[PDB]
Amino acid sequence: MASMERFLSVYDEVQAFLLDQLQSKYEIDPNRARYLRIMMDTTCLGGKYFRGMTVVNVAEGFLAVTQHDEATKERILHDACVGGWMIEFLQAHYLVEDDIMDGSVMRRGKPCWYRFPGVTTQCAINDGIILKSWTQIMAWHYFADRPFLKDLLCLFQKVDYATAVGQMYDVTSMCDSNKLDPEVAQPMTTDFAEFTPAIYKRIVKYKTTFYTYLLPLVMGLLVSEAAASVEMNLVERVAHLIGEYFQVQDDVMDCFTPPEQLGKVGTDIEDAKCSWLAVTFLGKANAAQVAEFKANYGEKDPAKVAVVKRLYSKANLQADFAAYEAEVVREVESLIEQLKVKSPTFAESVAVVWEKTHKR
Amino acid sequence: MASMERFLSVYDEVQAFLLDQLQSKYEIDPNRARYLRIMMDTTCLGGKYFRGMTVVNVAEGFLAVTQHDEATKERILHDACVGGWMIEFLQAHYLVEDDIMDGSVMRRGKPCWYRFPGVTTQCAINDGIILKSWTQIMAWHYFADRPFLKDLLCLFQKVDYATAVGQMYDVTSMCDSNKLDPEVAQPMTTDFAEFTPAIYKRIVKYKTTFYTYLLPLVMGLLVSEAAASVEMNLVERVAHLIGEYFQVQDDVMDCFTPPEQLGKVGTDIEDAKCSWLAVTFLGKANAAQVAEFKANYGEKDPAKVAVVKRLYSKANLQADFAAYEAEVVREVESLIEQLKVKSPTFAESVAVVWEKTHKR
Ligand SMILES: O=C1NC[C@H]2C=CN(C(=O)c3ccccc3)CC[C@H]12
Ligand SMILES: O=C1NC[C@H]2C=CN(C(=O)c3ccccc3)CC[C@H]12
Ligand SMILES: [Zn+2]
Ligand SMILES: [Zn+2]
Ligand SMILES: [Zn+2]
Ligand SMILES: [Zn+2]
Known about the structure:
The PDB classes it as transferase. It forms a dimeric assembly. By secondary structure, chain A is mainly alpha-helical. Chain A has one domain (1-360): Farnesyl Diphosphate Synthase (Orthogonal Bundle). Chain A is built from 14 helices and 2 strands. In chain A, strand 1 and strand 2 (110-111) form a beta hairpin. The longest helix of chain A has 33 residues, at 70-102. The interface between A and B is large, with 60 and 60 residues. The complex binds ligand LXJ (2 copies) and zinc ion (4 copies). One zinc ion (ZN) binds at residues 250-251, 254 of chain A.
């Protein structure tokens, strides 16, 4: 069975399980079950399933170099699928809530869930909550007798929290830390002194890397009973590196990818995001360029957004990007080599993860 | 040590733990730690701590009739305190998010968290997320080697999900089930055919009773290693009963308690809530009264709200309330007696829970 087709079949099984349980234990009626079914399909389905399929892929690598009964292979693959759907539903939680937080309009070329006419923010906040609760309902049902249950739950928990922390880093990234105060309306930074590589790196590490790269890799190890076969510090370090590279691409596209290809009109400039373009610009700009930037960044006015985009074009940030990229390729390959010491076949799963990130 | 003073001391300890961990493992800076500290104090502190103190109280009852070393008593009480704070933080999660969902203005005589000038909805949705993640960080840290950890996590998980389900029942309670559809803007019901006691009961059971009564009672049993000493079906049945009574009081106050005593301007009528007043009214009204109700319910217009309040006064719902109350007193006392069979001292903790609900 091809990995993708196995993974999508399990979606159906998990969906049927969750909804049958709502009926039989939670007194749901058919119409509210239908609403939740559509919510699940709309918020969970339609991407590439890179995160979920990572769990499956790691697990397949382990199976190919380990002795198991056929029924144990199926069990392990089914577990990887379920584990993968937990990460996919965790993302869907965060995407629903983040879209509401940010006033987003579109996502993957369709309206954000909260904007559906029969949804509204009042319901969508709660729907987002449900999406995360379903992660835990999955885990407890399918992994009830599994030896990895505790470690999986504890890991999941920590990634979740890290992601929420990162969300806090992200939405506060345009304020001056020393002015943060629940009592006082927050001004945008005027100096941009916190648009640094170290600061940028923290936002991304927490907001994106833990749930996108670390979790899928380590969950693939946990369901395979393979974690003690790899050096975990290396898994952490390579995840953070690749996850950083992923976000830098996403930042570059926000500004330069046409909206019909992005699936989104990008607003990073208008939202004054601590983006890789702004940090990297500020790291090479002269005084005049910096002042022009401060006079136009973080304002909805299209003329002002056009000025910042001009500044970024003239600043030759493609060069700094290719230099960043070259250094990431070096470090990732170094970490892949280090991972060959104890786990050559895991190393190759990491290599496929890096290739799919590096190309797309 | 008095139970309240122990419980509030543990808040400080848990707060210091969470924030020290953010610094030492999550790269937080002092200002963002300060923001989270204030968020925690603002959203977790200031109520009666009925839910959290329930866990402590159950545990104290067990200690008084069981043999333990002094250090084991302290351990058990500390665990009950931590367990209690998990429920208190779970409530704070739901209160933050519900206030945003509903456009609430005030809560306990102060502004809702999202309305704080330096917060905003963009941050508060995420702050609400954090509040729930902290429940799991507590549990994993303080209960890592505890024999009850799995059952506590599994219970917590199920209550959480039930509460989110109930929130869905609540916010959809004024729509016709057969019209629910994410694609189509939802009209308010015109027939009010779903304002029934069975329907009302489901909203409340899920939205409120599981996290307010069932969870605190059963968590008190789990930390005490006492769950196999009580009949769990009876704990469920008495929790649902008391939790229903609690909500009926809350519904009655929304409409009749002056806003300075409520801590809130009540909007149940304007929001067209499936409230005990509306259901009970509809269960005794004549044709004329029903038509007048349909012509004024669920509309912000103060004249229209005043009409509904008049209808409720003239309808003599105090009588149906005293009849409801008498029946609840009967059933609760019956269940308390049933609980004396296997667990007399637990029965008394349930009796204190009922008294504190019945009087306040
Ligand atoms: O137990 C082991 N010791 C040597 C090691 C040799 C090859 N293996 C891996 O590279 C591998 C590890 C984790 C997950 C997927 C694959 C399998 C595990 C083997
Ligand atoms: O193991 C037991 N069997 C009889 C029973 C007699 C009294 N007990 C209770 O009523 C009790 C139960 C759970 C929590 C708090 C108190 C203690 C447990 C005792
Ligand atoms: Zn965002
Ligand atoms: Zn982006
Ligand atoms: Zn509400
Ligand atoms: Zn109310």
